Every structure is written in C-alpha cells, then in structure tokens.
Write an enzyme that holds these catalytic residues in place. Structure first.
Site, mmCIF file in Angstrom:
data_model
loop_
_atom_site.group_PDB
_atom_site.id
_atom_site.type_symbol
_atom_site.label_atom_id
_atom_site.label_comp_id
_atom_site.label_asym_id
_atom_site.label_seq_id
_atom_site.Cartn_x
_atom_site.Cartn_y
_atom_site.Cartn_z
ATOM 1 N N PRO A 42 4.390 27.506 58.178
ATOM 2 C CG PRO A 42 5.519 24.774 57.454
ATOM 3 C CD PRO A 42 6.075 26.520 57.422
ATOM 4 C CG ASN A 44 6.597 30.798 65.014
ATOM 5 O OD1 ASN A 44 7.864 29.787 65.078
ATOM 6 N ND2 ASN A 44 6.300 32.102 65.309
ATOM 7 C CB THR A 45 4.129 28.471 69.243
ATOM 8 O OG1 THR A 45 4.594 27.237 68.340
ATOM 9 C CG2 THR A 45 3.820 28.241 70.240
ATOM 10 C CG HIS A 119 13.426 23.016 68.160
ATOM 11 N ND1 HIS A 119 13.566 23.180 67.114
ATOM 12 C CD2 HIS A 119 13.639 22.513 69.330
ATOM 13 C CE1 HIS A 119 12.558 22.473 66.940
ATOM 14 N NE2 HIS A 119 12.819 21.309 68.085
ATOM 15 C CG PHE A 120 8.120 26.554 70.838
ATOM 16 C CD1 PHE A 120 7.219 25.294 70.209
ATOM 17 C CD2 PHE A 120 8.648 27.056 72.129
ATOM 18 C CE1 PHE A 120 6.502 25.303 71.297
ATOM 19 C CE2 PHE A 120 6.771 27.372 72.359
ATOM 20 C CZ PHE A 120 5.966 26.349 72.646
#
Length: 124
Positions: A42, A44-45, A119-120
């Site tokens: 859904p 994402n960067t 993790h972002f």
C-alpha cells in the site's frame, strides 16, 4: 534467504536517481523491486542518497520507533525521498501508485553487526 539488511536496500534505496522525475516513478519502481508480486504493498518510500549516507543514520539521533521500539534513528539531515501510495484505481496485479517527491528527515530501525537499517519507519 534474503537478509533484512538486503531487503531494506531492495525496498527502499534508489541511489541512481536524485529524485523521481515523472508521475510513473512509483509504478515502475514498485514493480521492478518486486514489491507487488504477492499483493499491492500500500505504501512505500524510496531514498535517493548513497547507501553509505543511509547506513550512517544508525549512528545519528536515537528515537522511539512508531511502535515503541527503541532501535530507531532519525537523520540529522533532510534527504530526497519519493513516497508511493496506492491509488483508488489500484487492482492486483495492476498495482497503481501516486508518486510524491519530497526532502525530509528519515527514521529507520537498525539491527545487527554491522548495525545497519532493516526497516523504514517514517519520514519527518
């Protein structure tokens, strides 16, 4: 089996572009990095900096991660990022994304040795 550190690079690093340059960026990148294989992720960067500069965040400002974990770190500097958000027209397997380009500070969770991003967490 893909390590968490290599997964971070595949999902979040785009050192080969300084910014997204068309509204198709997200559609292209999400697909090419395989983020839409099983379902449409859904949100994402992508970060448009050198991996070294992103790994260095793991030694910058310690902050609680949004979920309360204490291994998150906030970049001292703003970074060129592209935010990709699923559109109302998104339909698996035709995942469709809105591309947003911005300069913000990033928040990542670090682990292991070497201590690198896995993790972002958020852009702020």
């Amino acid at each position: 089996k893909e390590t968490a550190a290599a997964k971070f690079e595949r999902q979040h690093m785009d050192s080969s572009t300084s910014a997204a340059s068309s509204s198709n960026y997200c559609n292209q990148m999400m697909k090419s990095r395989n983020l839409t294989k099983d379902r449409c992720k859904p949100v994402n960067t992508f970060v448009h900096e050198s991996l070294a500069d992103v790994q260095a965040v793991c030694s910058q400002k310690n902050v609680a991660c949004k979920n309360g974990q204490t291994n998150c770190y906030q970049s001292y500097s703003t970074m060129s990022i592209t935010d990709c958000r699923e559109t109302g027209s998104s339909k698996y397997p035709n995942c469709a994304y809105k591309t947003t380009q911005a300069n913000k500070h990033i928040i990542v969770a670090c682990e292991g040795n070497p201590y690198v991003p896995v993790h972002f967490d958020a852009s702020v």
